[PDB]
């Protein structure tokens, strides 16, 4: 399972199980470039979020019901959606993943 591999491989589930996580299969620069695209509000009302003009290749990792540390279990879902990231700093880079649409 790609999700099981990448979550422990990326130090996300090496010390516990995370309920959900999203991976974007695009170049780093292409994702950083979203910080100057469609400005929209974040879920918390904050206004430093931006939506990508185009859909992107992503894989959603969701923990099944039979998942318990130390044996996490994820269901893998591949799709193409617009990503929403919060940006901050200089360079104005993405610091948080807000959502996919």
């Amino acid at each position: 399972n790609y999700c099981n591999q990448m979550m422990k491989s990326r130090n996300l589930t090496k010390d516990r199980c995370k309920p959900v996580n999203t991976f974007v299969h695009e170049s780093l620069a292409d994702v950083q470039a979203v910080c100057s695209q469609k400005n929209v509000a974040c879920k918390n009302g904050q206004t430093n979020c931006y939506q990508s003009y185009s859909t992107m290749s992503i894989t959603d990792c969701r923990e099944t019901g039979s998942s318990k540390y130390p044996n996490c279990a994820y269901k893998t879902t591949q799709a193409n959606k617009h990503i929403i990231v919060a940006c901050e700093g200089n360079p104005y880079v993405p610091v948080h993943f807000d959502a996919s649409v």
């Binding site: 990448m6 990326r10 130090n11 996300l12 996580n21 999203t22 991976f23 974007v24 299969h25 695009e26 170049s27 780093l28 994702v31 894989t59 990231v85 901050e88 700093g89 880079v93 993405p94 610091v95 948080h96 993943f97």
Partner: peptide, 15 residues
């Protein structure tokens, strides 16, 4: 140690 930009990258980027 790790910046928020670096953490976001390692957690969500699979280019």
């Amino acid at each position: 140690k790790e910046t928020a930009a670096a953490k976001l990258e390692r957690q969500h980027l699979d280019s």
